[model samples]
Target: GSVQIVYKPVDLSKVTSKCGSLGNIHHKPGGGQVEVKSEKLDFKDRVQSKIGSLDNITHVPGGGNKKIETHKLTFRE
Candidate 1:
């Protein structure tokens, strides 16, 4: 007896980004807003041909809620 494997390709358009915003603060924080982004990749003709199996893939969307704080230097008498 032999087993037949069927593969299906996943559409990237279905993927979405999960992001948020950070509240305003007086101090400048290096790490501020945090978020997670994920996606599902199906194994099909394209994937199987390369990897020979299905694999889970996750992606992170760059550029989110960020703040750049700066102060001007003053000369003392």
Candidate 2:
């Protein structure tokens, strides 16, 4: 298999951590008010399609005011 530069952007919130350099990455807060449930998260003019892998991704309970969180998840599984 080969790795191609499909799309790459800046860091995101509620994404947990950026451990793996490449190959594959995965993360999801499950659900939250940040409420980010979609196939491709639009960023600037580019996008990284996270389909169902990061599908149900959303913000979580941090308390107080509602917070928006981005679900950083498995890149290529």
Candidate 3:
């Protein structure tokens, strides 16, 4: 069984711009509101995610080579 799935590039620019650094909760544990803004995900955090990835079942259907595609994002934004 071959189930193919592709993850498109995340729109980081539109995501960053949408985070105008204005949204916040007018109340807090102390006093002032907390600004919720988009942040460039830490590389370390991205790497750390591997451990939390989903576990998929592998069923081999005899001897055959499988080809998978890949993509890279240089989000220079």
Candidate 4:
């Protein structure tokens, strides 16, 4: 028994967020407050396409059908 593997193109939109200063408010001679806000940011992190085998061909020496699978990944800054 044998197995073949392949990866599909990644087409997921990456989401990002961070704290932003809305502004500063002062209510004294030496007292102030900093306002912070956050929102979702979208980024394109798409991967290129790939080529697969010619289906299942067990009669042509050591050959097998390429299996389709999604690429597992993580987010980074």
Which one wins on TM-score? Answer: 4
Off by over 4 Å in 3: 1-41, 44-51, 65-77
lDDT for 48 in candidate 4 is: 62
The full ranking of all candidates by TM-score, starting with the best, is: 4, 1, 3, 2
lDDT of 4: 0.48
lDDT of each: 0.47, 0.50, 0.44, 0.48
Kindly indicate the candidate among 1 and 4 with the higher TM-score: 4
Summed backbone clashes in each candidate are 0, 5, 0, 0
Better of 1 and 3 by TM-score: 1
Give the residue spans of candidate 2 off by over 4 A: 10-64, 75-77
Q: What is the lDDT of residue 5 in candidate 4?
A: 50
Ranking of candidates on lDDT, top first: 2, 4, 1, 3
Least accurate stretch of 10 residues (summed lDDT) in model 3?
11-20
- CA lDDT for candidate 2: 0.50
Q: Which stretches of candidate 1 lie over 4 Å from their true place?
A: 14-77
Q: Per-residue lDDT for 32 in model 3?
A: 42
lDDT of 2 by residue, 1-77 (tens): 77665556676555343333444335635453444565764467565555333245444433434467575757755
Residue pairs whose backbone atoms clash in candidate 3: none
Per-residue accuracy of model 3 over 11-45 as CA lDDT, tens digit each? 43321222334434343233344455665756754
How well does model 3 score by local distance difference test? 0.44
Please tell me which predicted candidate would have the highest lDDT against the true structure.
2
